[PDB]
Symmetry: D2
Subunit: 440 residues, 4 copies
């Protein structure tokens, strides 16, 4: 499952259809990023540039020109073929091959962007540009507009209107095509296999980073080279740190370990969390907290559907949590009064759900308090958790327990499809899986 | 093997000993780096900051003050303890614990750097600063100096002299302590085990990225979480691309694969290349090219010692290469005339050796044409290669062969120690290893 | 004659009437400008800021908010009252007095602009901003928009559309109100009195700068403290340098002197050039060139009216010039062929007319080749000239003669009114004026 | 009186003599400065660039290279000859004529500075640069150093040391040559004639700006085209505003007017203040305050000499002021206690003296509290004043009186020479001068 040339072209056209006549949209590639001295991080294309191109090179700009209501065309600026650069650093698409490969009308050398861009914008009414994203892109756009403003003796004119395309594009990204859902489904499956492998490999005395190693190897073998975010392996008290990434401790017999890891597959993110006993058996105290988080997730999975909202489902989870914490003596008082004072917040301090896509925290308008009404094609996470600080004023046996369980779902016409249910989360099914692996 | 608090302190003192009285040296941490939208790459500390601290947090500045020839002290600026930030993103050292943990005299909040730095520089004669490294650091230094220049009514004075500490510090880094060599020795061993594993796993039909996966998993399991540079797995014609990192092709029965991969262990880089047959057996043509590259490496390993230079050893390698290429009909003519016209350069177009340390292309002055005389404690690579382009005007059977063999060595009083000889490179030993693994 | 509070308010409303509902226009004051070290040039307000305010302080921003089609209001950011600053550098309007003084709804401290501006733009659809004019203004606008884009958890939203208000505002400025014309009429009269004074004072042996001194003193005494541009006093060969401002030479008996000088009166520019003999008597050669330039100007003054253009009148001037230069032997050949090859261009190398207003080269669209059709209310210069280089290949007696004659006019329903005809330009009237002054 | 080519050369050599061997000093011209839209302020050269060149063009850089202890040379970067630019905007020195005109060894085009500067700095140990003065200069220097740092494969090396030349150069500027003193003497005389003219012209009903006009005309006629700072004409309450420059009020019969104005002559500043009755006759109350300020000045003029300091003389003035204010009932109590509480500060809130030279507030170290011991060749102002706010809690008759009297002096071996004593300051001599002019 991937996204094809034709789908990138469909996206480009859908944007053009929303653009005013006499306008151009400019979409810039991500800069390369230094890791240390002359070495760079592995390149990650800008998600919006990727959305419209599938093109993984730096020093590139997509220009979509809508001359009027019937006529439009596309120009790519990209690195030139260069024998020496390519012998060193790799092959470049170049200008001759780009139109056919990418499905754009025209390709020009990036080195010529300052000589050419103003000529493309000359006499247009509107320029669409995501200002403030990249400094280098802003310099290019501002120079072009300045040349035009100052070029009246050469009969040049600048567009007077600049529109941020991000609201429109991000609304596009919020609703997945069936092809995007298939890619996300595959990301969910790959990520799930990785988490299953981590549970089967985990033993007391291994380091947190060892499970990271297992997870990344499993991602890679299915063709997802990189994670969509830095892997979290938080055992014991580290599980109470939401994005713990040091992963530097030896995992102890008697502690839980919380793994939050996701692959990046054809650009798209998985995002799964599983929490499980290091020694394969939940203690009573661990199980008591786990059951509340699991009920929260299972209830959310029953509820999520078109016509509800993250806010509405969040309210149901908050009640489940407050009720459970009261029953365990972690909270004291009347459930409804406790809910009204957001008494769960010391233990559940993050959102239940975020959008998921080309970014793990995907683009798209949530509405106030994430009240936006859900519709088919939206993809989101469901991640209740409870984190009991080592020094919390609660019964001693719960201190230092950090539990999150996170699945990735797609809203359908009839409810939701869970993309990540192929890795177990019922505590008895976790224990069974680990018992089987521990026998070899 | 690691670098301890006491050694970081020794380095700080050695710098201070080289500083003028009435001076301060400023060393800034690396900024965090965006991968996409709100997600960041895993943090990599600036190598020079690391060299003096072993401290892996951003928003930190080491200030070494030499008041006069007997009196000096250190101040660290670093992030404050912050409950909410730490529940989310991880633990911070903070100010109270820093002096004991790091062995500095004083710690202050990074948020206060603009209120405090000018006060530390007031009345000093010299500021040591690596200008142009980080824009954010330059803004901080320039603001402090501007406050002082403009503050005569408040009896403030700016140092009139700014000295780049990089030449002095990089000369320090060029000569490894025995403890640094032990860490590099371990990096070499970990990297070697990874390359052995790649050779034992490789089969026709696997993708290049699969061997990357094996390599990274082996790095991780020995506690080297990250590579020191982006892994190269170039099979077939891809082997002729020096830093090929796409690693996207299916490895073919009958092709070679060139793996260039190294771990980063306690900050220090390994850098190994092995080239080997995908199907476990060199063809005659592959073996003929391989033998020349191997002779070049073995000869270089015999020669490298105090009192020679990379230039001098490079000359010996060039002769070996020209001679071998003449014998195969790849070059035609008289060896000495061919050498004089650098006729090897279409096939060997990079340097034989680079320094190795906290960066894979490590700091340190090479001298003109890498003529600097070698001394004990210097660490460098030895990486001859031959790359025969698919369209080279040479006997057909050699086209598309890319071979490099790279080891990491330390110059000793009596010659060199090879840190990476635990992964095989003799062609018969490669074939034996692969035959054994292929039988299971 | 001046521009009143009510007229500034009318302009603000006319802008608001053109703005989209759900929008804000931002207009920024000019920065103060260093002359040397801690000393600054006398402050000149940004012309567009001035157009809407009549307010001559730095660190000020006019914000016009159009909430919807009936509701709108204005906010000024300006410097706070400050006892110490004012004892030193002068009185400030402050916040309490600004609404009544300027006729704005609300005033806030400039120091609070970063805390307040984003709140004013929150939830608007469009921001009108002249991007690239001032760096400091761009930083303020970009910060505000960035806060809003990134503030969705605080229910903030950025306008997605930014429109340059300069085309609309500059079109406003192009058409003068009767009150603006009265101010320009006064500027023309003041400037004319200055040029008359220069002619009456000029004697061989005086320096060019002496006539500058006379001119500036006359400007000042009528309440125009500053010139609208740097005064040009080009005697002899210096007259062939279009914007000669060194004014450093001793004026010679037998040379012409070209004075191009204009006052700035209530913000508005005069722009007059007169050329005249230093010794009070034109030579034959000087008179021969002068007559062509004068015919060009007199013809242009007869022609300029609604429905013609600068281009059309320029064609008539070019014919007059070519014809005259042919008659003198400066050009050789057939007039029409000479016109077709723009043979006048070595001697007349600038435009005949520019718009005139709050800038001497005033804002407004000229059309291609200054072809825009003239309408009542437009104000422009008429400045033919001929400049014969000291080394021109022409009859010797003409070399080093530089002559320009420039008047300022307003297009009326019935033609034009000459605002500067009160300083003489007929050569006999120049000689008479100078003869009278030279007798004392 | 001016500064010659030979003296600029002597200054350059004196700098070179202070420079380390293997070093280059870079001195940059001032940028041109926008007044409004396409119009610029009249150009003012950077004072330090001027000090070493006498060259009044922008886009120029002086490079002084000290190869070793015997060998040194100079290179100027400056604008190329350009026919079209010069026909428009004026003559340029260009490269061919610069060495002879300025006395530099070599001249190169400014357009080539980025291609040439790094080559001049290559292999030097020290670069002298005034960092933070001009952004454009910093970009040029930083680019050159970056090319060198990064150019080891081309055998380039950057100097590791950057030294601010301003402390050394400003110490040079602090001590005037006899030729500089002659120029300052002439500036003092020109400025004095202007102030005399203002007193002779002043009548009730004239505007403050009218006296500015008289002053600037007098500056101009002696060849000082521009003031050294914005002229202050503060009548009545405006006299209590130290740098009042609006000069917009009608001068009233019965008020004083305070004029602070100085010419800029061959680069050097005059700085004179005279306060006098608008109607030619001091009131008793005005005379009572005036006498204290005059005694302060006359005493300071008797005292200033080598071996004293501005601090020491300031103490004598403070006693004179406190004593006088006690006698008038403006201050109440014991003089010595009043002095100890700085009770004069509401009425005298600025320094008595500043250095004077190429800037009106000239460069040079003052010492703590301006305690530096005076030496021959130093040039400074002497400007006591008393400013009684319109709402001060003092006897009513003194409210709104602002008086300053300022002379410019040079410290000599035997005391000081007053450069500005040719304009009267004794109240009887002011009244006599004004009475004579008022009779015509
Ligand atoms: Cl390119
Ligand atoms: Cl959240
Ligand atoms: Cl902090
Ligand atoms: Cl190399
Ligand atoms: Cl303010
Ligand atoms: Cl023009
Ligand atoms: Cl140039
Ligand atoms: Cl002061
Ligand atoms: Mg997660
Ligand atoms: Mg998540
Ligand atoms: Mg390598
Ligand atoms: Mg290497
Ligand atoms: Mg003019
Ligand atoms: Mg004009
Ligand atoms: Mg003064
Ligand atoms: Mg003064």
């Amino acid at each position: 499952s991937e996204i094809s040339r034709q789908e990138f072209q469909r996206r480009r056209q859908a944007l053009v259809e929303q653009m005013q006549p006499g306008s151009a949209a400019l979409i810039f590639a991500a800069p390369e990023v230094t890791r240390s001295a002359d070495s760079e991080y592995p390149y990650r294309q800008n998600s919006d540039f990727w959305y419209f191109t599938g093109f993984n090179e730096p020093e590139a700009v997509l220009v979509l020109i809508k001359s009027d209501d019937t006529h439009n065309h596309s120009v790519l600026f990209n690195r030139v073929r260069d024998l020496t650069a390519e012998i060193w650093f790799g092959r470049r698409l170049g200008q001759d091959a780009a139109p056919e490969k990418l499905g754009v009308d025209r390709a020009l050398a990036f080195s010529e962007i300052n000589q050419q861009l103003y000529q493309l914008l000359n006499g247009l009414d509107v320029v669409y540009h995501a200002q403030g994203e990249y400094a280098y892109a802003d310099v290019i756009v501002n120079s072009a507009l300045e040349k035009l403003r100052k070029g009246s003796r050469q009969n040049l004119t600048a567009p007077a209107t600049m529109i941020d395309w991000r609201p429109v594009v991000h609304e596009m990204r919020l609703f997945k095509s069936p092809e995007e859902i298939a890619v996300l489904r595959r990301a969910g499956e790959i990520t799930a296999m990785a988490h299953t492998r981590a549970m089967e490999k985990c033993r007391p005395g291994m380091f947190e980073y060892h499970l990271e190693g297992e997870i990344h190897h499993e991602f890679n073998r299915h063709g997802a080279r990189y994670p969509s975010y830095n892997t979290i392996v938080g055992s014991g008290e580290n599980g109470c740190i939401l994005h713990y990434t040091e992963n530097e401790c030896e995992m102890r017999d008697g502690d839980l370990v919380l793994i939050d890891a996701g692959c990046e597959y054809k650009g798209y993110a998985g995002d799964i969390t599983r929490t499980f006993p290091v020694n394969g058996k939940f203690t009573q105290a661990q199980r008591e907290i786990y059951d509340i988080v699991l009920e929260s997730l299972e209830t959310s999975l029953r509820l999520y559907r078109p016509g509800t909202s993250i806010l509405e489902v969040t309210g149901e989870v908050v009640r489940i949590m407050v009720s459970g914490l009261v029953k365990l003596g972690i909270l004291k008082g009347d459930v409804d009064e406790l809910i009204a004072q957001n008494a769960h917040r010391p233990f559940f301090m993050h959102g239940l759900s975020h959008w998921l896509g080309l970014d793990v925290h995907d683009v798209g308008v949530y509405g106030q308090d994430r009240s936006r009404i859900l519709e088919p094609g939206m993809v989101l996470t469901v991640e209740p958790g409870l984190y009991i600080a080592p020094d919390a004023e609660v019964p001693e046996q719960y201190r230092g327990i950090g539990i999150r369980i996170e699945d990735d779902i797609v809203i359908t016409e009839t409810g939701n499809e869970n993309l990540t249910a192929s890795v177990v989360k019922k505590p008895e099914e976790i224990e069974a899986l680990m018992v089987a692996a521990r026998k070899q």
